[PDB]
């Protein structure tokens, strides 16, 4: 197969010019075609053959190929054009192949550190010998964070899930994360917390079976 | 023109799925359409195609042997058969017209298929009561775990749909057990909290369940 | 008369195989035939059944869904065809002629159809020396591992053949690993330790591969 | 479905007479049919409907059903009749059912001690992460055994797999089993342990990565 390079992320304010680079082996030879994919719905044809635009699709996306590199160009960037970018190309050798796709965030709005909630476990899934905790990050951006659980300080491996960042109505994000266990292990300790990392910065909640 | 695809479809490992796509006009005249596919977070990776008007159809190295992209009589719909089903062909599938020169202008909705070994399950819902203390002086956040159903989705209201300033309703997780997991939470004024009931409305179609939790002060 | 069924099969999970039943005089007549399947060590377990000369067939609640018994157009044929193999179809498979109060007179030799996640691996061969002490003070005991080989089966012999008496060659193991293992052993006079050059000879066609192991004393 | 229960084992010495029994629900009500299988060979339909010998079965088998109970019987005990018996019925509600089956031992033979051998690992598998003992257990009648290792004296759960005694040229029975761990284990223990147990009685072997 062949293989299509892309950056996994792209940043740009508002107005601002954004460029998604694409690369691969003599790329140049090759027709490229950009698809636009927003949450939820399908991809969208926006530049194909190199620099062709289709009906429907604004000036504002250029395309451009040439060498080992091809490069979808979005001027004057509207939060609009917020959406994961994929390159592609037609390799008699790979068929259809795909780049790894980049998201584009159209940083319109400043930094919000995100607020932390975690609720122990509700008594009544202990009925079911269960016992999980909850830890609801919201209003952060950008969307990206991480997050760590510790049981009594230290790290904790087993039982975690996590969901990756989504808008919230306000165009804000937030996430949730999950420590699984049983009511033994829930009672057995003097505490829990769930730690937020954000932007450099860190955020963490702790609850006590004793509280 | 336009390409429709089929509904969701849940299936068991081992088993197999067959996907539709119909063109929108009655035919596909002399188009090839292809078979995309998308992993959840996942890209876009190619599957095969097919061209209706010559009865030919190509294939991906990667699927060759467990797909199988057919038509019917009036070459109005183009169908993808993938066999063996895995926990990795969880995915979702498109279909798409493609380009002289290489590329795909349309696409269809796609079509969602999880691929699991559970079997259909209605949700435990707990409550996330606010804590003795208070949240954020003013302030107060409650909400509801809707844990282990089995498929999605769920949907979540607050109050019957009174309550919907404050409210956020969380993704899904997907956990070791294949079951599925998630939580709605609303912001509502600390002093709420003792004089005004908080419910939320669970309702799981696919298991004809309904749960309206009650959630109150720890 | 008798009834020929076709060779073992070997498949990965998910697949599908499909076994042969041909009688004997040309055709099944107006004979009922069954298949009945057999896991190691386990009983025997009837699958279904079909009459070529009706065109009709029966099946088990268990595999209602997964199997089809079919025959071929001179129903001098009838076939089995199991899907979505699990680790747990691994059995022999038999065919066998329904009487008319309800036994089966006529039996296949069988066929064997494992179902593995394993590719075909040729075997490593360890030695079991002898101890520096010696076994049963007279005669000793030394032999080979054949560890790790997928699928069955391997022979094993002794210096060409030659070595016959005080010979055992153990049946195979199926570790988790998915892998094969076994054993051979030969009692020889302790004297003949040291100055007796002692190989056993493994074979493993289903690799092209043959290990002459040497096994010295420790 | 419906149930056949047979004894699971039925010892019998040459000469004498074998009864294998079968029970299940009005079972007297069906039509009764035994098959004889031995090792590596398909079923052999030996008496159906109830009583009939097909041709070429001796007539020493006989068979009889009433109750909720199907006999199977072998007069005059042969070598020849050592084998597994299934008796099956056909039931409109299940098909066709067979009993759990019953092993004939033909006790023509004195009871024989198990000889166990216990080869330690050959350095040559360390080359492969690997460091296997094998266990031999041989010259032994009737054909049941248990074995257990042990590792400086306590039992061992994990890495244990051991083969069903089967025939070995002399009419006796041979068993194997092999103990799977990393050559690190195998060399950091004093010594490791094989305990067969037969007709009662316990053979055990040990070997020390010293020795």
């Known amino acids: 197969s062949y293989e299509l390079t892309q950056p996994p992320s792209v940043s740009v304010a508002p107005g601002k010019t954004a460029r998604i680079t694409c690369?691969?082996?003599?790329?140049?030879?090759?027709?490229?075609?950009?698809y636009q994919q927003k949450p939820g719905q399908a991809p969208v044809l926006?530049?194909?053959?190199?620099?062709?635009?289709?009906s429907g699709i604004p000036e504002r996306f250029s395309g451009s190929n040439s060498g080992n590199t091809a490069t979808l160009t979005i001027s004057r960037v509207e939060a609009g054009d917020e959406a994961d970018?994929?390159?592609?190309?037609?390799?008699?050798?790979?068929?259809?192949?795909?780049?790894?796709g980049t998201k584009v965030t159209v940083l319109g709005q400043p930094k919000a550190n995100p607020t932390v909630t975690l609720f122990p476990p509700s008594s009544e899934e202990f009925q079911a010998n269960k016992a999980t905790l909850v830890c609801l990050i919201s209003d952060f951006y950008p969307g990206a964070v991480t997050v760590a659980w510790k049981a009594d300080g230290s790290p904790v491996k087993a039982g975690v899930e996590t969901t990756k960042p989504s808008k919230q109505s306000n165009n804000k994000y937030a996430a949730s994360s999950y420590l699984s266990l049983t009511p033994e292990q829930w009672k057995s300790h003097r505490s829990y917390s769930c730690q937020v990392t954000h932007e450099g910065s860190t955020v963490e909640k702790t609850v006590a079976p004793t509280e | 023109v336009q390409l429709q695809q089929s509904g969701a479809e849940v299936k068991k490992p081992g088993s197999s799925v067959k996907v539709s796509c119909?063109?929108?006009?009655?035919?596909?005249?002399?188009?090839?359409?292809?078979?995309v596919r998308q992993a959840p977070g996942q890209g876009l990776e190619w599957?095969?195609?097919?061209?209706?008007?010559?009865?030919?159809?190509?294939?991906?190295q990667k699927f060759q042997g467990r797909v199988t992209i057919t038509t019917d009589e009036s070459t109005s719909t183009a169908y993808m058969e993938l066999s063996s089903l895995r926990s990795e062909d969880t995915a979702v599938?498109?279909?798409?017209?493609?380009?002289?020169?290489?590329?795909?202008?349309?696409?269809?909705?796609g079509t969602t298929v999880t691929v699991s070994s559970a079997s259909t399950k209605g949700p435990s819902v707990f409550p996330l009561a606010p804590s003795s203390k208070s949240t954020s002086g003013g302030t107060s956040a409650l909400g509801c775990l809707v844990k282990d159903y089995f498929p999605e989705p769920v949907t979540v209201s607050w109050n019957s749909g009174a309550l919907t300033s404050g409210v956020h309703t969380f993704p899904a997780v997907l956990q070791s057990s294949g079951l599925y997991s998630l939580s709605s939470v609303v912001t509502v004024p600390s002093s709420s909290l003792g004089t005004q009931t908080y419910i939320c409305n669970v309702n799981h179609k696919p298991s004809n369940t309904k749960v309206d939790k009650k959630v109150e002060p720890k | 008369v008798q009834l020929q069924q076709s060779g073992a099969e070997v498949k990965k999970p998910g697949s599908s195989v499909k076994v042969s039943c041909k009688a004997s005089?040309?055709?099944?007549?107006?004979?009922?035939i069954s298949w009945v399947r057999q896991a190691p060590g386990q009983g025997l377990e009837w699958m279904g059944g079909?009459?070529?000369?009706?065109?009709?067939?029966n099946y088990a609640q268990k595999f209602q869904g997964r199997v089809t018994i079919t025959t071929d157009e001179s129903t001098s044929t009838a076939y089995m065809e199991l899907s979505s193999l699990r680790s747990e179809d691994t059995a022999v498979y038999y065919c066998?002629?329904?009487?008319?109060?309800?036994?089966?007179?006529?039996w296949g030799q069988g066929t064997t159809v494992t179902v593995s996640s394993a590719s075909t691996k040729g075997p490593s061969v360890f030695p079991l020396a002898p101890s520096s002490k010696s076994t049963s003070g007279g005669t000793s005991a030394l032999g080979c591992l054949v560890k790790d080989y997928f699928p069955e089966p391997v022979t094993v012999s002794w210096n060409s053949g030659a070595l016959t008496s005080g010979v055992h060659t153990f049946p195979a193991v199926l570790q988790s690993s998915g892998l094969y293992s076994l054993s051979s052993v030969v009692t020889v006079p302790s004297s003949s330790l040291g100055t007796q050059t002692y190989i056993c000879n493994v074979n493993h066609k289903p690799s092209n591969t043959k290990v002459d192991k040497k096994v010295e004393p420790k | 479905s419906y149930e056949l229960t047979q004894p699971p084992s039925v010892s019998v010495a040459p000469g004498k007479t074998a009864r294998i029994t079968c029970g299940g629900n009005?079972?007297?009500?069906?039509?009764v049919h035994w098959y004889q299988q031995k090792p590596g060979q398909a079923p052999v339909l030996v008496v159906y409907?109830?009583?009939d010998r097909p041709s070429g079965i001796p007539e020493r088998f006989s068979g009889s059903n009433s109750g909720n109970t199907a006999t199977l019987t072998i007069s005059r005990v042969e070598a020849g009749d050592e084998a597994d018996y299934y008796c099956?019925?056909?039931?409109?509600?299940?098909?066709?059912?067979f009993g759990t089956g019953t092993k004939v031992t033909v006790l023509g033979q004195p009871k024989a001690n198990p000889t166990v051998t216990l080869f330690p690992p050959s350095s040559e598998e360390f080359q492969a992460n690997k460091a296997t003992l094998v266990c031999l257990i041989s010259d032994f009648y009737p054909g049941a055994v248990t074995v257990a290792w042990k590792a400086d004296g306590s039992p061992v759960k994990a890495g244990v797999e051991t083969t069903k005694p089967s025939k070995q040229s002399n009419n006796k029975y041979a068993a194997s089993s092999y103990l799977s761990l990393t050559p690190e284990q195998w060399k950091s223990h004093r010594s490791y342990s094989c305990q067969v147990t037969h007709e009662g009685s316990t053979v055990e072997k040990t070997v020390a990565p010293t020795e």
């Open positions: 066998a002629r329904d009487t008319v109060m309800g036994g089966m007179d006529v």
């Open positions: 005089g040309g055709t099944f007549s107006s004979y009922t």
């Open positions: 079909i009459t070529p000369i009706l065109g009709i067939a």
């Open positions: 009005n079972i007297g009500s069906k039509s």
């Open positions: 409907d109830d009583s």
């Open positions: 099956q019925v056909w039931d409109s509600s299940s098909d066709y059912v």
